[PDB]
Nucleic acid binder design. Structure first.
Ligand code: ADK
Length: 231
DNA sequence: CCCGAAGTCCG
DNA sequence: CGGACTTTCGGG
């Protein structure tokens, strides 16, 4: 079975505009885990737009197929485009897509893709269906996969006043001993972000519970101005 | 325009 | 460790 024509068209059009000179530092920035074509986001968005204008966006029956085929292509711009395309199908994504999103998290994994999946697509799903959190989060924390662990930390990132504080702190407590940078930093990030909504609770948490030094410092990057740094 | 959100380099 | 500085991206 041939590649979906929309994906083939995108591949052809991206490749025709590749920039090997830019590709080298772009790939180095992601620690050479991926090949790059060398197309940065403004042009990459326009090239996608070009193909939608010519071909139209595929029927929703093909949504998951298109995403997978792009995920399987070697150059990282195709996963970035896949995520742009998933946003175009946003109104069709629901709680039944959690396993599909899980599989995207644990394939071609790195912070650029995982952070584009978790606080937005998964965050929205669990905001609407909080009763499903306990069907996934314990497994993610227990897994060997640091990107599922990061997903458990960051899916609430944008919740603001809808944050489940008890859940957030329980998740952080489970992962606070991790020596993995991407886990320590995610803990720092979600605490720093939630402190914009409720600084008192984050300050109390970091003063009274164990965290990696990186996590604590990132958490209080801003609110240390509000409380002061004791001698 | 601005500000806030990985990478290298240094002490 | 933790700060200074880097380029890119999202968004006010
Ligand atoms: C991706 N990226 C680029 N530049 C910065 N200053 C950043 N801080 C966090 N993440 C960043």
């Amino acid at each position: 079975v041939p590649m979906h024509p929309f994906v083939k068209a995108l591949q052809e059009h991206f490749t025709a505009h590749q920039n090997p000179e830019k590709a080298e530092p772009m790939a180095r920035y992601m620690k050479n885990h991926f090949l790059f074509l060398g197309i940065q986001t403004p042009e990459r968005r326009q090239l996608l737009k070009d193909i939608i204008q010519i071909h139209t966006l595929p029927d929703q029956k093909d949504f998951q197929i298109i995403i997978r085929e792009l995920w399987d292509l070697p150059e990282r711009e195709f996963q970035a485009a896949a995520l742009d395309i998933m946003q175009k199908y946003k109104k069709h994504i629901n709680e039944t897509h959690i396993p599909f999103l899980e599989e995207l998290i644990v394939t071609k994994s790195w912070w650029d893709s995982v952070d584009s999946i978790v606080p937005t697509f998964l965050g929205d799903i669990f905001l609407k269906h909080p009763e499903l959190i306990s069907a996934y989060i314990p497994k993610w924390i227990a897994s060997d996969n640091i990107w599922l662990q990061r997903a458990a930390i960051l899916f609430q990132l944008k919740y603001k006043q809808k944050m489940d504080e008890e859940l957030l702190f329980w998740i952080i407590g489970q992962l606070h001993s991790s020596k993995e940078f991407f886990i320590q930093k995610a803990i720092g990030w979600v605490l720093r972000e939630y402190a914009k909504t409720n600084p008192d609770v984050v300050w109390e948490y970091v003063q009274n519970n164990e965290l990696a030094p990186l996590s604590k410092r990132e958490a209080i990057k801003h609110i240390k101005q509000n409380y002061g740094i004791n001698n």
